[PDB]
Structure 1
């Protein structure tokens, strides 16, 4: 869950960060999950990092599903350059989250362990989150 293997166009207009989650608002794979309540751009280094945290705690007990994939590339201009002269080069890959989106799913592990793991993941992550269970009823 780091980078797209290939993209057609590599310097893309930045994403819209205003509105509500187009989809992925439900736990489909897991038992407990984690959704977001603000919006931010979530980078690959942050996802990888929240993952290590979550899965160190669960001690390789149950499964994990990352629901957010970093698709959009972003650019940064070289240091100390003036304005103009083209667009800069790719610095990282992102994937926009908006209030509602589930970011992580888990199963095959007790409820309290899952809640602790998703808590530890939440702090390595730049968006306010919430703990959710597989919606039923």
Structure 2
């Protein structure tokens, strides 16, 4: 529907990626963060909505980041066509999420309000989730 998050293309058509597996990508900025866990990938529209939520329920300002950005398009072509001919026009952008990325992170608040806003996010995304504290990476050198 809406695609605010965008960039210079460099190219407008691309073979997809479809996810298999990974871990990692701990928290580095804030304290509290959301961990995606499971089967899907994403468009930007979704992320925007989640940001609306996470900005409202936190008054007192309260800081947010998005560690990821969609670097990839999502093509989908005219309605009720026969297959065959050249790959279709643009409709979307994509930020793939294996199990282990950390989409949303916050700090400036307590442990609770974070957790609420993150519930109110994970209902508004495909992926199952998990709540995390920044206490440890798996490497510090």
Structure 1 residue 22: Cα displacement: 5.9
CA offsets, 1:97-125, max 9 Å, x none?
A: 01111010000011101111111111111
Q: Say if 1:89 and 1:60 are closer, same or farther in 2 by CA, change over 3 A.
A: farther
Q: Say if 1:17 and 1:130 are closer, same or farther in 2 by CA, change over 3 A.
A: farther
Structure 1 residue 136: Cα displacement: 2.9
Q: What 5-or-longer segments of structure 1 have no aligned partner?
A: none
Contact 1:11–1:90, Cα closer than 8 Å, also in 2: no
Deviating runs (4+, > 3 A) in structure 1?
1-24
CA distance in structure 2 between the partners assigned to 1:124 and 1:15 by the alignment? 27
Q: RMSD value over aligned CA atoms?
A: 3.1
Q: Say if 1:51 and 1:21 are closer, same or farther in 2 by CA, change over 3 A.
A: farther
TM-score, normalised relative to structure 1: 0.84
Contact 2:12–2:90, Cα closer than 8 Å, also in 1: no
CA distance in structure 2 between the partners assigned to 1:46 and 1:5 by the alignment? 11
Structure 1 residue 3: Cα displacement: 6.0
Q: What 5-or-longer segments of structure 2 have no aligned partner?
A: none
Structure 1 residue 58: Cα displacement: 0.8
Structure 1 residue 71: Cα displacement: 1.1
CA offsets, 1:1-43, max 9 Å, x none?
A: 9869876766667676666666762111110000111131111
Q: Say if 1:101 and 1:16 are closer, same or farther in 2 by CA, change over 3 A.
A: farther
Q: How many correspondences in the alignment?
A: 137
TM-score, normalised relative to structure 2: 0.82
